[PDB]
Ligand binder design. Structure first.
Ligand code: NAD
Ligand code: NAD
Ligand code: NAD
Ligand code: NAD
Ligand code: TCL
Ligand code: TCL
Ligand code: TCL
Ligand code: TCL
Lengths: 256, 256, 256, 256
């Protein structure tokens, strides 16, 4: 595969519907060796089953709200992977109250704090912690959403965290590029996942996109995963700091 | 002038070089009634002097890091301006350690938290706090920098904070527009100010910019203040959720 | 007013609904001296009436499809305004066949040629033709549409023409800035005008926009003219090579 | 390869340094069947040698300035490829005089005409002519440059043609998407090619980029070709109307 000889760490696999899950499959189909992290014990065993299917016995607990957790995970990771080639950051979070109705009324200081910390900061946090274990030709990838670029109803403060994140991709890419590390983001169209269910009228959001999207269908985790495998492979060597839209063309069309 | 009948609240006047200062002067020259806030005790009397000069005797304290301070300032404001027509948010802050050398190495969880809290959240926190005192036709304004859109050396996490901020403008503009409130931002080119001194080799920025800028000069606080008065007056009724670049054209040129 | 002492040349007044008309009115309300051009004989007397009303008796013919017409208009202009302070380019055209149904099927080599020639080239052709009559502090302005940035149904090749136009603003701003000339564009939201009637289901555009627009209303020629007066006055000294959106916020929102 | 079972037509191979050449290699390495066009007889035999190496005996003359030439080529193409899966548009042109010094002085009506016609229109022209021979899952790709987004010295009118083109990708993608056709663009960093030699100080342009680019090197046709193979493969199914930057990160960095 085009990822043969690559060791990539994959975050965010909550279930078989997760973008991370679809991403690991594409990467594994492409010859990459994978390592998975699980946020907690509620998720532990599940992630272990998926690791096994993708031929990996590296499943480490990691909660990006904690520096020491990121730190410990990388330590256990180095035991098998002293040096690796990148990671996939598929982690996003905002307190439930943050996501519905008028943004100005919903947003609070803490919610803003948590949303930016978990969705934006965690990306660089993970980079700091493993920066020295990365081989040249490494690539990091995170997942963003159009709410970063446009004011989308109910997405509220998550739109700001995503905007922060995209700026992170640029700052990381400019800082880590000179040492052989690329950093990019896939701006994915809406996909029904556990987290998606936290946004009001997601079902109508999906149907809308399916209708107004040039390709005339919503994207799949297979679609996203394929772009992800590419962005983390040497095939995308000339791309860094880029936010690739994998939404079928939705954001470029208008009043369809 | 074109702001006659407008009562505007101006924040961030730390000195006669402050962008907020240059903005207050233009808004005063165009007929507006102003109210000033000062962050702390160190700045108080300085702000009172300028206020007096701009014919205002409404100088209230406000530390945007504290909700209670934001809430009290508006209660105090209500006593004189039960209803007013918008405010200028000219506040920014990132801990000193954050602003120099490699981004990834420089950034920390608290620096990120703080940079975002003071540079981005505070904007919406203020809007929430006075949402009901705003008259139809009200305009809210904030100041951003190109760091939001491009990875600029040393600007580091402040670029991420601005990215979040510009997103905020869009989400606030979308949320408040329905009740008669516009929200926009001026993306100002570099200007030597108190806070400007906190970035490495700023002197070279200013000169680099002066040379590669289409208008061939760096912008002024007079420049920025005229655009801000415009953006907080009825002259800009057709504009909302916009980040206008008052950088003399610097960002649209390349390899000049 | 803020344009007192400014002599501006206004193009594209086809009627009292014309954006150029609403612009001329604001520029006149702010103290500017205007000069008007009319495309042909059919429009001549109409333009003379408005001119007279806006206190001007300088009405010259100008078909931007002909260099010689552009050259003669300026020679005639020189006789009264040897030097002036900029002009408003409010001219757009694509053959009728170009504007409806599927883009690819609708577009032809000549329609493309024409749409670009009249909607984009003409802007720089006029600047070339008067480059030496422009005083320092001069401003050039043009009008664009969101079609440049997003694929909008039926707008077809005109969107490509606008894309070329917005690029022109940037290249002209960069080239002329050094001699004291700023060049910008207003990206106006839909407004019912003579040319507006040439697009399919425009009535539904206007209503769709009125509903999904942050300010909850479509912009007016008054709205656009105040932003244009601002952009052609010294109030916008810090702005050049910029495409300001006077669409009430429509483009920054999504799935409203 | 990931392009196995794909028949792609490749335009623009002038020499072994051509972006098209590097693109065909990547596509051929990935299992795709290719067909090549040559603009003229000066180029004919050369393109035939490259076709042979890439295992293709389909080399058709095509000059995109002529509808009948595009038309005839597709007719001869259908003889072997009744239906195919897409094409690579790597064609750009502007009269020599257009490319040096002050844009406003260099640009002329004809130069603008030719530059837009050959660099922008030809893309859709080719799409019109073959629209019905495309299988579902087809993808078209064109090559753009940052001069479309920023005013780059000496690029002059080519920057406008590229802006027109990028708008074309969006219009094409929105029109052809519903029938199973994606349209995208690679915005390539500077690469020394025959055409490149038409831009003043290209050598200094290259060195600059190599220094200020996050990856710290200029891109290669291998880099571009790899992204091209991906954008024309089912791997990029969720991407359409996108302008992917393959420039190492140059456009996202600032004042490096
Ligand atoms: N699904 C969509 O429609 C969509 C579209 C664009 C982008 N995204 C992004 O893709 C990523 C994956 O989202 P998803 O939709 O697949 O949902 P998901 O629920 O499958 O995955 C969310 C993941 O984030 C993890 N996470 C959150 N907080 C954590 C923490 N504190 N520490 C460690 N892990 C934590 C959860 O365990 C989970 O594995 C998110 O960034 C999301 O914003 C989603
Ligand atoms: N100066 C530049 O070149 C430039 C360019 C682009 C953007 N900006 C932005 O303009 C705004 C004003 O900054 P400036 O350059 O005029 O500098 P300045 O130092 O004169 O003012 C910044 C203001 O921030 C206030 N502030 C800091 N923390 C705050 C808090 N906790 N509570 C209340 N107020 C707070 C300070 O009192 C100060 O008045 C900032 O957002 C800045 O990022 C400046
Ligand atoms: N009306 C809208 O909703 C809207 C929105 C965005 C952009 N625009 C732009 O505003 C500008 C003015 O158009 P409008 O909507 O006011 O319509 P309008 O029909 O009132 O005016 C367009 C003008 O184009 C002039 N024109 C056409 N070909 C020209 C030529 N060959 N020589 C000289 N002049 C030429 C006509 O005389 C006419 O005055 C156009 O660029 C248009 O694309 C309009
Ligand atoms: N090389 C770079 O630095 C760079 C960067 C970004 C984008 N691009 C684009 O890539 C494409 C390929 O450029 P290149 O740099 O490889 O140069 P090149 O000289 O190898 O290729 C240019 C091709 O366009 C063809 N062409 C031009 N007019 C033609 C016509 N009338 N009909 C048919 N074919 C014609 C020429 O035969 C040639 O094959 C162009 O669009 C160029 O703008 C180049
Ligand atoms: O960002 C997303 C965008 C869409 Cl359309 C759907 C799901 C998304 O993902 C999230 C949304 C809200 C929270 Cl709290 C956490 C996550 Cl992971
Ligand atoms: O944002 C700015 C951009 C420039 Cl070019 C100059 C000064 C700026 O203002 C700040 C920079 C850093 C911090 Cl800590 C706080 C502020 Cl207010
Ligand atoms: O650009 C426009 C955009 C909108 Cl929404 C409405 C009218 C416009 O104006 C034009 C549209 C088509 C052609 Cl043929 C010429 C012009 Cl002047
Ligand atoms: O677009 C380009 C951009 C760069 Cl940096 C280098 C070469 C380019 O390609 C061209 C430039 C000018 C002409 Cl007339 C034709 C072509 Cl193909």
């Amino acid at each position: 595969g085009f990822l043969s000889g690559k060791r990539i760490l994959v975050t965010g696999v909550a279930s078989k519907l997760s973008i991370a899950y679809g991403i690991a499959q594409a990467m594994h189909r492409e010859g990459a060796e994978l390592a998975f992290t699980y946020q907690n014990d509620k998720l532990k065993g599940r992630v272990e089953e998926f690791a096994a299917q993708l031929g990996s016995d590296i499943v480490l607990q990691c909660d990006v709200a904690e520096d020491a957790s990121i730190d410990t995970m990388f330590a256990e990771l180095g035991k098998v992977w002293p040096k690796f080639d990148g990671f996939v950051h598929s982690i996003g979070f905002a307190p439930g109250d943050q996501l519905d109705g008028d943004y100005v009324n919903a947003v609070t200081r803490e919610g803003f704090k948590i949303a930016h910390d978990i969705s934006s900061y965690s990306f660089v946090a993970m980079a700091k912690a493993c920066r020295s274990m990365l081989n040249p030709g490494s690539a990091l990838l995170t997942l963003s959403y159009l709410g970063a670029e446009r004011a989308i109803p109910n997405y509220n403060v998550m739109g700001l965290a995503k905007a922060s994140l995209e700026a992170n991709v640029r700052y990381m890419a400019n800082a880590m590029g000179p040492e052989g590390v690329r950093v990019n983001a896939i701006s994915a169209g809406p996909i029904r996942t556990l987290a998606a269910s936290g946004i009001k009228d997601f079902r109508k959001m999906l149907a809308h996109c399916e209708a107004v999207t040039p390709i005339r269908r919503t994207v799949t985790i297979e679609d996203v995963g394929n772009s992800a495998a590419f962005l983390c492979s040497d095939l995308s060597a000339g791309i860094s700091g880029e936010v690739v839209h994998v939404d079928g063309g939705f954001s470029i069309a208008a009043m369809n």
